Design a protein around this ligand. Structure first.
Ligand SMILES: CCCc1nc(C)c2c(C)nc3cc(OCc4ccc5ccccc5n4)ccc3n12
Ligand SMILES: [Mg+2]
Ligand SMILES: [Zn+2]
Length: 322
């Protein structure tokens, strides 16, 4: 497992954020894209702002973040950029719904988002379970996500990395649970059930944030919303991100071909033409319903729904040749 150098976490301690970035970070549609060098410092800032400067021991935090960074691989999409992207969206939702969530939860959720794709390979849970690869035997379901959490704990177990040590064993065990459920929730195979339950609970008015299982379900949908948030950016960022995703999908399809298996059209680079229709279907069946139910449960998150509506509109425009 990769460990940051002495030169990386200390430099991060030194980092400060420009004034104009402080303002824009608060926007849902903010794109971290153009600020690569500043990405670690952006997360620190977000953590300090959301949780408090007294929250974690700075030195332990810097080690943790820079070591998380080194455990993201050089893959087209499920990389370090994705991790910070997802953490930022979480920060925006949390800032607009601050007191609905406890100190511990905001700490856990921010750290969970950063680590939620730790050591991703560019391969889906479908690939691994239908090939093997020991990970699918180690985790029969949810599968990469179980691996991501395993990695999260491993990095915490590195010397001077455990940011949660100053917590009482009660709060400590809780924050791990928060992180575990939240990371697992990022398996999209689970999202569909989750959103139906939440839809059912909201429409009937059963929904109660004092109810832990309800609260667990809300957190998981927030995770889905953050995980998918590239659909909520300005169109050219969304379109550029779509390239990265397909780069990974097609590379998975290519390894499948090498091993004598036909991949689905989504992972088939020969089926490039079907992308806009595939996107349209993803927005209609996944993204739109996600951000709709989210807006219902958390009204301040509506700009997320709006941006996704806008991007759906764009994909429709591509389909009809415009
Ligand atoms: C697994 C990553 C989840 C995810 N995060 C984002 C942020 C996206 C985004 C933005 N788009 C996604 C599109 C998908 O599949 C859609 C699809 C379905 C059938 C196809 C057939 C041929 C060509 C492309 C197809 N695409 C599947 C997952 C998508 N996705
Ligand atoms: Mg994932
Ligand atoms: Zn992800």
């Amino acid at each position: 497992m990769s460990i940051c150098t002495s030169e990386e976490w200390q430099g991060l301690m030194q980092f400060t954020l420009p004034v104009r970035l402080c303002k824009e970070i608060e926007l849902f549609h903010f794109d971290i894209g153009p600020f690569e060098n500043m990405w670690p410092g952006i997360f620190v800032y977000m953590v300090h702002r959301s949780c408090g400067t007294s929250c974690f021991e700075l030195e332990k935090l810097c080690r943790f973040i820079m070591s998380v960074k080194k455990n993201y691989r050089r893959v087209p999409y499920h990389n370090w950029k994705h991790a910070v992207t997802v953490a930022h969206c979480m920060y925006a939702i949390l800032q607009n719904n601050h007191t609905l969530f406890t100190d511990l939860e905001r700490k856990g959720l921010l750290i969970a988002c950063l680590c939620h794709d730790l050591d991703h390979r560019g391969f889906s849970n479908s690939y691994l379970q239908k090939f093997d690869h020991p990970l699918a035997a180690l985790y029969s379901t949810s599968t990469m996500e179980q691996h991501h959490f395993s990695q999260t704990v491993s990095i915490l177990q590195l010397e001077g990395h455990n940011i949660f040590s100053t917590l009482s064993s009660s709060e400590y065990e809780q924050v791990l649970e928060i992180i575990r459920k939240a990371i697992i929730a990022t398996d999209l195979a689970l999202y569909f059930g989750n959103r139906k339950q939440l839809e059912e609970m909201y429409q009937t008015g059963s929904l109660n944030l004092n109810n832990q299982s309800h609260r667990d379900r809300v957190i998981g949908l927030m995770m889905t919303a953050c995980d998918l948030c590239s659909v909520t950016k300005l169109w050219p960022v969304t379109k550029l991100t779509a390239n990265d995703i397909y780069a990974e999908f097609w590379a998975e399809g290519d390894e499948m071909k090498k091993l004598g298996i036909q991949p689905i059209p989504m992972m088939d680079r020969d089926k490039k033409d079907e992308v806009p229709q595939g996107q349209l279907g993803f927005y209609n069946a996944v993204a739109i319903p996600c951000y709709t139910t989210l807006t219902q449960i958390l009204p301040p998150t509506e700009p997320l729904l709006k941006a996704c509506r806008d991007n759906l509109s764009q994909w429709e425009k591509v389909i009809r040749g415009e």
